[PDB]
Each structure stands twice: as structure tokens, then as C-alpha cells.
Amino acid sequence: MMVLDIQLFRDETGANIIRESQRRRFADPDIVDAIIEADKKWRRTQFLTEASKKLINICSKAVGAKKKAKEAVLQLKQLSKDLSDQVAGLAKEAQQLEEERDKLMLNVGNILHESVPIAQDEETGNTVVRTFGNTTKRAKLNHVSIMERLGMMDTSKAVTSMAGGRSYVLKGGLVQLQVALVSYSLDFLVKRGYTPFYPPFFLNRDVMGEVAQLSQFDEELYQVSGDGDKKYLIATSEMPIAAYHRGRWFTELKEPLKYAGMSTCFRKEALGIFRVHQFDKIEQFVVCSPRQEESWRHLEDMITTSEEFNKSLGLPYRVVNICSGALNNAAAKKYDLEAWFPASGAFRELVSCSNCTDYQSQSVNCRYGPNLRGTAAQNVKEYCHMLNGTLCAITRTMCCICENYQTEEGVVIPDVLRPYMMGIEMIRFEN
Amino acid sequence: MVLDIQLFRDETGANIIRESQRRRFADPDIVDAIIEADKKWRRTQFLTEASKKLINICSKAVGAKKKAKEADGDTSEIPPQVKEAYENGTLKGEQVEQLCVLQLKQLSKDLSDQVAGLAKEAQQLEEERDKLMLNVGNILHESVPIAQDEETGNTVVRTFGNTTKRAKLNHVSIMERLGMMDTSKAVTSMAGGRSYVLKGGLVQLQVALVSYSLDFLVKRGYTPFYPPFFLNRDVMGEVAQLSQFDEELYQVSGDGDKKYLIATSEMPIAAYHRGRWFTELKEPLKYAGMSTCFRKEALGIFRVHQFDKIEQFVVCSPRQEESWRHLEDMITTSEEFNKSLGLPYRVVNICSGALNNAAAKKYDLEAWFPASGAFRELVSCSNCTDYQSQSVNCRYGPNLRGTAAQNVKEYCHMLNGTLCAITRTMCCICENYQTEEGVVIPDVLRPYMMGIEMIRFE
Ligand code: NA
Numbered sequence: 001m002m003v004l005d006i007q008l009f010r011d012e013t014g015a016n017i018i019r020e021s022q023r024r025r026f027a028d029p030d031i032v033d034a035i036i037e038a039d040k041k042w043r044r045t046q047f048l049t050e051a052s053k054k055l056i057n058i059c060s061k062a063v064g065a066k067k068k069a070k071e072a073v074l075q076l077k078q079l080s081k082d083l084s085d086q087v088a089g090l091a092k093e094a095q096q097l098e099e100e101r102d103k104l105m106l107n108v109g110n111i112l113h114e115s116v117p118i119a120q121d122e123e124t125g126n127t128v129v130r131t132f133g134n135t136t137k138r139a140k141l142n143h144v145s146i147m148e149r150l151g152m153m154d155t156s157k158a159v160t161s162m163a164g165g166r167s168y169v170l171k172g173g174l175v176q177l178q179v180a181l182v183s184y185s186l187d188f189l190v191k192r193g194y195t196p197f198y199p200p201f202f203l204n205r206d207v208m209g210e211v212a213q214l215s216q217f218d219e220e221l222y223q224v225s226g227d228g229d230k231k232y233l234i235a236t237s238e239m240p241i242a243a244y245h246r247g248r249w250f251t252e253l254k255e256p257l258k259y260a261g262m263s264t265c266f267r268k269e270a271l272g273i274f275r276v277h278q279f280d281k282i283e284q285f286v287v288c289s290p291r292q293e294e295s296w297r298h299l300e301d302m303i304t305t306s307e308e309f310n311k312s313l314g315l316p317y318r319v320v321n322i323c324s325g326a327l328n329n330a331a332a333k334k335y336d337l338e339a340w341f342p343a344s345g346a347f348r349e350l351v352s353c354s355n356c357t358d359y360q361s362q363s364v365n366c367r368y369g370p371n372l373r374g375t376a377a378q379n380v381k382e383y384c385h386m387l388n389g390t391l392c393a394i395t396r397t398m399c400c401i402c403e404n405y406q407t408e409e410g411v412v413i414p415d416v417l418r419p420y421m422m423g424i425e426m427i428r429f430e431n
Numbered sequence: 432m433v434l435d436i437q438l439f440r441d442e443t444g445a446n447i448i449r450e451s452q453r454r455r456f457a458d459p460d461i462v463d464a465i466i467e468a469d470k471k472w473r474r475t476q477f478l479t480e481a482s483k484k485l486i487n488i489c490s491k492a493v494g495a496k497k498k499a500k501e502a503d504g505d506t507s508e509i510p511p512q513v514k515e516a517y518e519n520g521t522l523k524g525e526q527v528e529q530l531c532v533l534q535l536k537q538l539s540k541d542l543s544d545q546v547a548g549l550a551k552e553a554q555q556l557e558e559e560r561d562k563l564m565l566n567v568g569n570i571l572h573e574s575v576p577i578a579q580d581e582e583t584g585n586t587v588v589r590t591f592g593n594t595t596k597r598a599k600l601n602h603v604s605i606m607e608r609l610g611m612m613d614t615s616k617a618v619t620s621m622a623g624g625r626s627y628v629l630k631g632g633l634v635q636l637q638v639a640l641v642s643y644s645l646d647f648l649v650k651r652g653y654t655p656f657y658p659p660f661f662l663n664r665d666v667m668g669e670v671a672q673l674s675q676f677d678e679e680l681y682q683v684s685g686d687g688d689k690k691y692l693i694a695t696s697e698m699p700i701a702a703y704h705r706g707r708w709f710t711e712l713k714e715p716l717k718y719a720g721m722s723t724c725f726r727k728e729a730l731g732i733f734r735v736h737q738f739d740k741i742e743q744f745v746v747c748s749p750r751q752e753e754s755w756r757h758l759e760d761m762i763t764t765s766e767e768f769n770k771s772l773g774l775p776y777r778v779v780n781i782c783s784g785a786l787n788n789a790a791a792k793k794y795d796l797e798a799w800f801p802a803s804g805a806f807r808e809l810v811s812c813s814n815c816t817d818y819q820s821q822s823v824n825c826r827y828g829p830n831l832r833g834t835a836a837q838n839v840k841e842y843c844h845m846l847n848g849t850l851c852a853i854t855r856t857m858c859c860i861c862e863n864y865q866t867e868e869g870v871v872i873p874d875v876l877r878p879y880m881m882g883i884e885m886i887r888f889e
Pocket of ligand 1: 134135136137
């Protein structure tokens with residue numbers, strides 16, 4: 001279970017910050033008190049447990065000194081046993097309280113940035129930050145009609161009877177385009193200092209729970225079985241990249257860690273190729289210092305990077321700031337880049353960029369800085385900040401390119417992609 | 432020869448199969464079992480057809496009697512000889528027409544029960560049948576070496592490059608020193624045994640190989656094909672053997688019914704041709720399959736559960752030995768691919784006992800790994816003639832109105848072969864292109880990874 005850091009709840013100022021954030025997200029602030037109470041009883045079990053373990057050795061040391069002195073102890077033995085009984089009792093309580101606490105926390109979101117719009121309904125509540133290109137342009141055929149006329153996409157029963165609903169085959173020029181986008185995307189981020197990262201597409205349940213919200217198991221994740229422990233297919237490379245930092249500790253990050261995640265993603269989603277179960281994606285993932293609001297600076301760079309990508313492709317768009325009621329729990333702020341689809345006549349999400357601050361990193365225990373011990377200055381456990389953002393969701397981007405670059409003869413290939421597909425200038429309609 | 436169940440029913444055909452089994456050091460007695468299970472099966476179909484006709488005769492006879500106002504009759508009881516005759520497939524319509532309405536109605540019901548019992552027998556005879564067919568191989572090509580054991584029985588056909596040079600570090604050591612491959616507990620505690628993370632230059636190399644491989648086949652007239660990575664059980668059973676389910680395939684669930692992850696793009700490409708009928712294939716269908724592959728497998732990244740692969744898949748005419756010509760071109764394409772990368776190798780003709788059931792003949796290309804001191808398989812190409820096509824029912828020839836029970840149904844031929852198994856090729860390149868400073872990028876890949884000439888040790 002991925003939830004917010006308990007430390008912030010343990011003083012009045014932080015509890016007030018969380019209650020305010022809850023109200024601004026249209027969530028329950030009264031939850032903060034319930035979490036504080038559950039935690040207070042939990043801490044009490046831990047206080048008694050540590051004190052009783054201490055007294056177990058007083059019981060042992062005493063027998064050790066007495067039987068050394070050859071003395072007729074029988075109480076000290078019984079007291080060791082009973083204290084060990086009490087510790088076992090305290091552990092069962094302690095475990096129940098952790099589960100109740102973490103359960104309550106499922107409805108506590110990350111602390112909202114001060115710039116998040118306050119609204120419940122995305123339809124009207126998102127705030128438009130910037131726009132690019134002719135976002136009122138009109139065109140003849142939608143992406144579905146285009147890919148059909150190209151003869152290069154099959155979403156018919158020949159496919160769906162093999163692979164189930166929303167499965168597809170790509171062929172020909174559209175596969176060339178897909179691979180052009182993967183390679184160009186990778187190079188685009190390499191040039192901006194990202195390290196390529198190719199993850200496993202499976203994660204164990206244990207680890208998936210640390211990086212995924214519990215509603216994602218329900219609605220989004222396929223389960224894979226056979227070889228060893230049960231696993232889940234990844235819905236994004238952000239999952240395995242976040243999980244790769246579990247139990248790490250970065251004393252300093254003068255430079256952030258920047259990864260260009262490359263994978264196939266799988267989503268249960270519980271037409272054409274815009275919303276499908278299986279898709280390639282290139283993702284930006286950043287791990288940085290939690291200090292001086294550095295993470296906020298990287299969020300601006302990441303959305304800017306995605307914009308520059310779409311500018312290079314010549315795709316018109318708007319960037320929106322996602323309202324408080326629609327943000328997922330992990331995100332303190334989220335930008336979506338919504339491309340304009342001129343045949344369809346709609347803005348459609350191609351990219352989202354999120355600052356999750358320490359939400360994931362505290363769940364995976366990715367620590368930062370110096371330890372509580374030794375140095376008198378450190379009182380709080382610090383954790384790295386983590387951000388993630390799409391660079392290119394390949395099928396969605398192909399759909400957008402198809403509508404924007406169509407002609408009577410086919411789909412013109414965006415200039416920058418041509419050298420990544422054998423110099424091809426256009427893929428042509430079958431007819 | 433057209434291998435389908437029809438070949439088993441012909442005496443000369445049954446002998447061709449028995450011989451092929453013996454040449455494979457496999458069981459020829461299976462053939463008698465398939466014949467016998469099939470005979471029981473055909474009997475259920477003969478009875479079902481007879482009884483279906485008699486049910487329509489019953490209905491028509493009741494209709495004519497009702498129209499004539501014939502009395503319904505004294506009893507519904509069916510004569511024992513009538514029951515014996517439909518149980519034996521010898522009940523004639525003219526005898527059924529002697530019965531009264533009450534009897535005709537009872538007989539209709541009884542024949543309907545008979546048809547339902549026969550459909551369950553039919554099914555259970557098909558399962559008992561194919562379970563016995565599980566063990567029969569494709570008819571061997573005449574050029575297949577006859578031996579049981581690969582290590583001595585394969586024939587080296589052809590070699591390229593310096594296959595005796597040695598090198599210092601194996602691919603595992605190289606990828607460790609690059610700092611670009613993680614297979615430690617940080618990864619395996621996340622994703623299980625044999626999982627890996629690739630970083631930096633090795634991802635760039637991986638993508639360079641995918642893109643170059645695709646282009647290589649596009650230039651040779653292959654059509655790129657990006658499949659779903661899932662197949663329903665139903666469909667997976669038509670393109671895989673039962674031993675692949677147990678030993679090789681991950682099961683996926685959540686959305687809909689259970690599916691299996693693909694172990695090769697050959698699987699969904701074959702499956703995609705199910706029920707098709709190509710009347711003429713003047714040119715063959717050539718596909719460049721591009722996918723991630725998943726194998727349950729029941730060091731480094733040579734043998735891993737998850738890997739990218741580019742494959743060749745051909746559907747062609749079953750006539751004039753055309754598929755034998757395509758097998759030659761396919762192995763030659765894989766060879767030119769490895770020559771273009773500067774990798775030494777040998778090509779081996781796989782022996783009869785080591786061939787999997789679908790293949791009538793198989794070439795493997797085993798690349799020389801100079802630090803490991805060994806040939807390791809990078810590529811297999813095989814001609815499966817009509818074995819998968821018969822299972823997926825991909826027919827060939829005229830498809831016209833008015834054709835009755837076709838003495839010989841023809842099916843397409845299918846072939847498949849690796850162009851590039853990406854992780855295995857990367858291991859091979861690392862051994863063959865290592866220097867003191869890192870790994871030199873093969874000339875042809877450089878334009879596919881930003882002109883990078885070398886990836887350096889950490
Ligand atoms: Na406009």
C-alpha cells in the first residue's frame with residue numbers, strides 16, 4: 001500500500017497542512033484526527049514493547065548473576081516468559097493498528113501545491129497554462145479512418161478473437177512510424193541528459209504495492225502467473241523505476257538522477273489505437289534532492305521537455321494544470337499536455353507530468369541526506385523527491401500525427417522522424 | 432504429400448508417416464492409434480448425420496399426417512428394431528414413415544438425445560485423438576540428417592568469419608564493467624529470477640538493433656508486423672504444443688478470460704492466418720514480426736524471460752517445392768544480417784531426433800563467442816510446410832461455390848525464422864567487439880545510435 005508519510009501527522013503544524021490540503025482536494029479533513037489517534041495507540045505499543053524487551057535482558061542478566069552465585073530466580077524466569085507473552089500480544093495489536101492507520105491513509109492525498117486549481121470537475125476546472133499552434137484547425141479524416149485507409153492497422157475480429165477486446169495489429173508503414181517514434185524519443189531525452197532505462201515488465205505483488213495505488217490493482221493491472229511468485233504487468237515504466245530505488249539512500253544529489261524509461265505498458269482499462277491495453281511508452285523519471293523546492297524546478301523542465309518534443313513534431317496543443325479534485329493521491333501537482341485532434345475536433349491527453357515529492361520515495365524508503373544518529377542537526381527522516389512524466393505515448397502520438405499530417409494521398413511523415421524511418425516522406429493510402 | 436488427417440486414412444500416406452516417425456527416432460505405433468481413434472470419431476459423425484436427416488423426415492411425416500388428419504395413433508412406443516437400426520445407422524426414411532404421429536414425435540426426441548450423446552463422444556474422441564497426435568512429427572525433408580543427438584548429429588553446412596579467435600572477457604563480465612546491466616537482487620527482488628535492467632549505451636544498442644533489423648527486412652520486401660503480446664488459451668492451443676504451456680508460457684489474467692504471453696511473434700502471426708484461404712500466392716506473404724517475447728524457461732542476459740525479437744514469417748504456396756526455396760532465402764537473410772554485423776558463425780542442419788514436431792527441416796545459425804570459446808545459437812529457421820497451417824486451417828487453392836467433399840484439401844506452407852534475438856546478439860557483439868576501453872559499436876549500427884562509435888567501461 002502506497003500512502004502519505006506518517007511523520008507530518010505527528011505535529012500540529014503538519015496536521016493542519018494536511019487538513020487544509022484535504023479540504024482543497026475536496027477530501028475528508030476529519031481523517032487526519034483518526035490517523036493521529038490510531039498512530040498514538042500504535043506508538044504506545046512500540047513504547048511498551050521496547051521497554052519490555054529491555055526488561056527481558058534484566059531478567060536474563062539477573063539469573064546469570066544469581067546462578068553464578070549459586071542461589072535458590074524462579075520468578076525472574078516466569079517474568080521473562082510473561083514479558084515475551086506481552087511483547088507477542090503487543091505485536092498483534094501493533095500490526096492491527098498499522099493496517100487500520102494505513103487503510104485510513106488511502107484517502108489522504110499528497111499536499112497540494114499552492115498553484116493547483118481548486119475544482120472538482122476536470123471538464124471545466126483545469127486551468128490552461130499555455131497553448132501552441134493552430135488549436136482550432138480542422139481536417140477531414142479522424143485517426144481511425146486514416147489508419148483504416150492506410151491498410152496498416154487491424155482491430156477487427158481476426159485480432160480481437162485472438163487477443164480480446166481493444167487488441168490490435170500494426171503493419172507496414174505504421175510499424176516504421178512506431179519504431180521511428182521510439183528511437184527519436186530515446187535520442188531526444190539522451191541529448192537532454194537522461195539515462196535510458198529498460199525495466200522488467202513484471203513486478204512482484206509486494207513491490208507493486210509500494211509504488212501503485214490500491215485502486216490500480218483493481219482497475220489497471222494484469223496478473224501474471226506460472227514462474228515462481230505471482231506478478232503484475234507494469235502499467236508504466238515509472239513503476240519499476242520507482243521500485244528500483246527501494247531501500248536506497250542518497251546522501252547528496254548535487255545532480256538529479258534522470259531516467260528515460262522505455263517499455264511496453266499494459267492496462268486492463270477497467271476507438272482505433274488511441275486507448276488500448278498494450279502500448280509503447282517513453283517516460284521521464286527524476287529523482288532529486290527534497291530541499292529548496294528543487295523538485296518544482298524539475299517539474300517545469302519536464303513539462304517544457306514534453307512541449308519541445310511536440311513542437312518538434314509540429315503537433316498543436318494546450319498544457320493544462322489539473323484541478324485539485326481530479327489529481328491522484330501521489331501527485332502534489334500535475335500538468336497534462338493535451339494535443340489538438342483536428343478531424344476529431346478535441347483536445348486529447350498525450351502527456352502528463354507529475355511532481356510526487358516524497359509520496360513514492362517514502363513508500364519505497366528512498367532516503368536522502370544524513371542520518372538521525374551522530375549529527376545533532378537531523379531530527380526528521382528525509383526522503384528523495386520523485387517526478388514522472390510521459391515523453392511519448394507512442395500510439396496516441398501516432399493517432400495525433402495521422403490527423404495533423406493527413407493529405408488526400410496518405411499521411412506525411414513529420415520532418416524530424418524521416419531519418420528514423422528510412423527517409424520516408426509519406427505513407428500512402430491503400431486505394 | 433498434403434499432411435492432414437486425410438494422409439493417415441490413406442494406406443500409402445500412413446506408411447509415409449510411420450517412416451518419418453522412425454527417421455525421427457519417434458514412435459511409429461502412434462499412427463495406428465490416430466487411425467483407430469479417428470475411426471471411432473468418424474463413426475460418431477456418420478451416425479449424427481444419419482440421425483439429423485431422420486429427425487427432419489420425422490417432422491415432415493408428422494406435418495403430412497396432420498394435414499391429412501390421420502389419427503395420432505395408439506402408442507408412442509418405438510419398436511426395438513427401429514431403435515437398433517438408428518443406433519447402427521441403418522434406419523431408412525421409408526420405415527420411419529410407417530410409424531404413427533405419436534411414435535414419430537417420440538422418435539424425434541430419441542434421435543435428438545442420440546445426437547447430443549454422440550456430440551459428447553465426438554468431442555471426447557477428438558481430445559483422445561490429438562493427445563495421441565501430440566507425439567507425431569512433420570514429414571521430414573529428404574536432406575535432414577538422421578541422428579538422435581545434436582552435439583554430434585547436426586551437420587555443419589557453412590561457416591563465416593574467424594571462428595577460432597579468442598577474447599578476454601565474456602559477455603557477462605563486459606556488461607558488468609560497462610555499468611549498464613543490472614541483474615542483482617535490486618532487480619530480482621523486484622521482478623524475480625533472471626530479470627534484468629538495461630541502462631545507458633546498452634539500451635541505445637538494443638534500440639539500434641531493433642531499428643536496423645526492421646529496416647534490413649523492409650529492404651528485402653518483408654512487411655512489418657507488430658502483434659498483440661497476449662493470446663487466448665483457445666487460440667494459443669492451435670499454434671503451440673501442450674508442452675509449451677507447461678514449460679514455456681506465462682498465463683495472464685484480469686481483463687476477460689485467461690490469456691498467455693507470447694514466446695515468439697510466430698505465434699500471433701500464425702494465429703492471425705487462422706481460417707484464411709489464399710486462392711493463389713503468386714508472391715508469398717512475408718512478415719517481419721516485431722515483439723517482446725516472454726518465456727518461463729521451465730548468467731547475464733543470454734537466457735532471460737523477457738527479450739525483444741525480430742522474426743521472419745513466410746506464408747507461401749504448397750506447390751512446386753516453393754517453400755524449400757524460401758527456407759534457403761530465409762537462412763541466407765539471417766546470414767547476411769550477421770555478416771553485416773561482422774559476427775562469425777556456422778550454419779547447422781538440425782538432425783531428425785532434435786527437430787521439434789512442426790519442422791520438416793531446420794537450420795540454426797550459431798555465432799562464435801570468442802571469450803566463452805563456443806558456438807551459441809542466435810537464429811533458427813525452419814520450414815513447417817503445412818503443419819501449423821492445417822491446425823489453424825489456412826487453406827490454399829480455388830475457393831468456389833459448388834465444391835463437394837474435397838478429396839485433397841490444400842493448405843498454405845508456413846515458415847518461420849529468427850532475424851535477430853536482441854539480447855543474444857548484444858552478448859555476441861560485446862564479446863566480439865570488446866577492447867580495453869569498452870565495446871566498439873559495429874559500423875552498421877552506428878547511424879542507429881546517434882553515431883556512437885564505442886560504449887565505454889565505467
Ligand atoms: Na486558430
